[PDB]
């Protein structure tokens, strides 16, 4: 028995949440459907132009470890934020939630990351991020006994951004193989890949990755093709396992020759898909570590995400596992 | 012409808004649909017991300007915040929404007013506000020519709370009232009302307040009665307008001797009480100033509470212009 199920590291934030039209996205050259990161000056301006709006704790990674906890794993947290109001709110919610978060600010300034997202009438979401505290997130942050004894370590591909993120990653990744344990990463958003294409393709190959979270773009975004079949053989040989999601065509595990196909949920109606990848990595690692399928973890994670998207904001405000019980998931 | 329809003035107040059973209420001593003020400590206390939470711009008249402003009326809005991150917010979300604020940030400490409201399975909302920089709100806030240049100021009954506030309301009946103008108050709170009875029918027998907004429960609370007859006869004696609202059962409008019913809207489900008596205030005072019956006021009033109490959240998410329109109220 170990003390965790699943540990996640990413970039702590807060997220300011608005509606918008499509032209606002086209006025404000904001690249729609991804994670724009932006300087203190082009924050100010956004919110300027930005719609009255609410604020709810996120970070890809703070997102899926919360979606652990709230299945019913036991998870914990890596991320920095500043000692101000908005890292004040990102504590609570995460501790609240019973997900492990111990990582100490360094001061007020910078000031806690905070990210802008314009939802659009069809429920897709663009970020507008300021990494503010984030920047400061290094291998001092390591809490060594807790990658030990974490069955999984999860990690955003966003980490890349920051400047010191990968060292802290680099060390997690050590200490999780010399015990036996399993490393994990998201791809997080194709500019991102784009942006680390090699880098990432070399975490998996030399196997500091075992298991590979992507979305079509991103796939295609890492092999530079339009060719999704491409695409899906060379992400199955670059890592051990890859589960690659595509949006209401579902989900497919990869692992070797072997391919699981998942369904996507049926949805009522795309309210915000802001949260969708997280949670997806939140239901199949929650899986994962309970010592399901891979076809079954594939399907807690359509299970989470298509919860999260029929909602405003990034963590879901009812129950996954109560979710996942009537699911017959359990 | 005019520079405003409706200003409002009351204790600007960031929302941390979580979902709880009915048993934490009795375990911490939370009294149910009622505004419980709260110190310092006791406000880190149940913040360390709440859920993950999300935050919105709340605050009883900020509400209701911001519900006037949604419809296309034009609203100003007087309440203090402190210079912090919760007052950025707070500042950005009500000007956003095309309000007129002005009043300034004394410093950092104490720091915004923050209420903590607990949605029960019931919808019902149960809030525990830390007054902070509320308390500082006093005449110097009063802007006198934009109080000159409003069709009505409204204010709470809140506002009696902290111990200079009433004296700027003091300042505003005598500007609007010397420039033709009126003034409107709601009773806020049935607890509320106990704590300044008298008070609060002085304001209303010497005239310095020509509209009074209530609830049943405020009704009976204000004539210590369990008579709803006797106290809408009493109401209408002590006030040129009352609208007294009803929940599921509409609302009625009084004046003299004149009295119009309205029907509450139907509803797909009770999501979120919160913001339900602001938004009626908001609809009902848009009509006003627009130069509409008192019946049509009350529709207008029970059109935005009803759409308001089917989202999370005390300011609606959506066009009340557009919902108006499509309702045929226009
Ligand atoms: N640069 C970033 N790094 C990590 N998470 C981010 C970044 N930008 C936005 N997010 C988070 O992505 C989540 C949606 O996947 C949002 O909750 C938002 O907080
Ligand atoms: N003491 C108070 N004064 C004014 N508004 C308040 C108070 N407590 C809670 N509120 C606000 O009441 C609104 C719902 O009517 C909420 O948005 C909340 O912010
Ligand atoms: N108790 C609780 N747990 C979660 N995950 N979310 C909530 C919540 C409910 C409504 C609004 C915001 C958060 N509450
Ligand atoms: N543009 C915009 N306007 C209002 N009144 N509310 C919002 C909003 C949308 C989603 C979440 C929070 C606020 N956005
Ligand atoms: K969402
Ligand atoms: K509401």
């Given at each position: 028995?170990?003390?965790?199920?699943?540990?996640t590291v990413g970039n702590?934030?807060?997220?300011?949440?608005?509606?918008?039209?499509?032209?606002?996205?086209?006025?404000?050259?904001?690249?729609?459907?991804?994670?724009?990161?932006?300087?203190?000056?082009?924050?100010?301006?956004?919110?300027?132009?930005?719609?009255?709006?609410?604020?709810?704790?996120?970070g890809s990674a703070g997102?899926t470890?919360?979606?652990?906890?709230?299945?019913?794993?036991?998870?914990?947290?890596?991320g920095?934020?500043?000692?101000?109001?908005?890292?004040?709110?990102?504590?609570?919610?995460?501790?609240?939630?019973?997900?492990?978060?111990?990582?100490?600010?360094?001061?007020?300034?910078?000031?806690?990351?905070?990210?802008?997202?314009?939802?659009?009438?069809?429920?897709?979401?663009?970020?507008?991020?300021?990494?503010?505290?984030?920047?400061?997130?290094?291998?001092?942050?390591?809490?060594?006994?807790?990658?030990?004894?974490?069955?999984?370590?999860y990690f955003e591909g966003y980490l890349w951004d920051?400047?010191?993120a990968?060292?802290?990653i680099?060390?997690?990744?050590?200490?999780?193989?010399?015990?036996?344990?399993?490393?994990?990463m998201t791809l997080s958003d194709?500019?991102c890949?784009?942006?680390?294409?090699?880098?990432?393709?070399?975490?998996?190959?030399?196997?500091?990755?075992?298991?590979?979270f992507?979305?079509?773009?991103?796939?295609?975004?890492?092999?530079?093709?339009?060719?999704?079949?491409?695409?899906?053989?060379?992400?199955?040989?670059?890592?051990?396992?890859?589960?690659?999601?595509?949006?209401?065509?579902?989900?497919?595990?990869?692992?070797?020759?072997?391919?699981?196909?998942?369904?996507?949920?049926?949805?009522?109606?795309?309210?915000?898909?802001?949260?969708?990848?997280d949670?997806?990595?939140?239901?199949?690692?929650?899986?994962?570590?309970?010592?399901?399928?891979?076809?079954?973890?594939?399907?807690?994670?359509?299970?989470?995400?298509?919860?999260?998207?029929?909602?405003?904001?990034?963590?879901?405000?009812?129950?996954?596992?109560?979710?996942?019980?009537?699911?017959?998931?359990?």
């Amino acid at each position: 028995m170990t003390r965790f199920d699943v540990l996640t590291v990413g970039n702590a934030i807060v997220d300011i949440i608005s509606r918008c039209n499509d032209q606002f996205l086209i006025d404000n050259q904001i690249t729609k459907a991804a994670m724009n990161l932006i300087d203190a000056e082009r924050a100010e301006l956004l919110y300027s132009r930005m719609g009255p709006a609410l604020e709810a704790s996120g970070g890809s990674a703070g997102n899926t470890a919360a979606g652990v906890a709230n299945l019913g794993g036991k998870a914990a947290y890596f991320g920095n934020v500043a000692a101000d109001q908005l890292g004040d709110i990102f504590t609570h919610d995460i501790r609240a939630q019973g997900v492990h978060y111990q990582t100490k600010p360094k001061g007020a300034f910078p000031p806690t990351a905070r990210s802008m997202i314009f939802v659009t009438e069809d429920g897709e979401r663009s970020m507008n991020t300021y990494l503010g505290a984030c920047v400061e997130l290094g291998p001092e942050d390591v809490e060594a006994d807790v990658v030990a004894d974490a069955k999984v370590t999860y990690f955003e591909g966003y980490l890349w951004d920051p400047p010191r993120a990968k060292e802290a990653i680099l060390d997690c990744a050590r200490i999780a193989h010399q015990h036996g344990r399993e490393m994990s990463m998201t791809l997080s958003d194709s500019f991102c890949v784009d942006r680390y294409r090699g880098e990432f393709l070399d975490l998996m190959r030399s196997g500091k990755v075992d298991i590979v979270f992507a979305n079509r773009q991103e796939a295609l975004s890492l092999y530079q093709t339009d060719d999704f079949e491409e695409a899906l053989n060379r992400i199955a040989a670059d890592c051990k396992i890859a589960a690659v999601t595509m949006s209401e065509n579902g989900a497919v595990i990869l692992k070797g020759r072997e391919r699981y196909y998942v369904n996507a949920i049926r949805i009522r109606e795309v309210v915000d898909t802001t949260g969708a990848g997280d949670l997806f990595a939140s239901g199949f690692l929650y899986g994962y570590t309970q010592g399901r399928s891979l076809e079954d973890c594939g399907k807690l994670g359509c299970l989470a995400a298509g919860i999260v998207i029929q909602q405003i904001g990034p963590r879901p405000m009812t129950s996954l596992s109560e979710a996942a019980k009537q699911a017959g998931l359990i």
